[PDB]
Amino acid sequence: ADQLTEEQIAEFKEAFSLFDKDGDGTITTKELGTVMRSLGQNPTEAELQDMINEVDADGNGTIDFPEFLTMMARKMKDTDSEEEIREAFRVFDKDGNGYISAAELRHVMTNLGEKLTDEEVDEMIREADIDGDGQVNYEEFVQMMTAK
């Protein structure tokens, strides 16, 4: 209700510090989209008006960080619990073949920020890979979301 997983801890710190330069406690509204996009996220302006509409319910002109991911937790938790996983293929699965290959995770990484060669990927996959085909499936990419 108040906190989720380290997922919040990973970006609620940056979504806070990426734009809290004014020293206004939390990050600005007109800039929240950018604190959101500076994270690699590509949201809508209309939803940016939907969230600014939801947060500006107090009238402070700023955006709390521990309570916004919670908004993201509810944007996925109640909508579809089945598609919530398959969307990760929307995240990593590039070749749309069902298997997020080592080039795609690399191409993921490149999109996300890192470049990863052929021999450096044979660790990102093996980490989730059960059979070791070199192309991460659902259950490998999935178990690693629970494995720990």
Binding site: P43, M76, M109, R126, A128
Partner: peptide, 22 residues
């Protein structure tokens, strides 16, 4: 890290369609 790598990358990008609208 050698045996754990997606576990680290997932925390950053585990969900995208949650805040995405197309």
């Amino acid at each position: 890290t050698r045996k754990k790598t997606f576990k680290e990358v997932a925390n950053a990008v585990k969900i995208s369609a949650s805040l995405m609208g197309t």
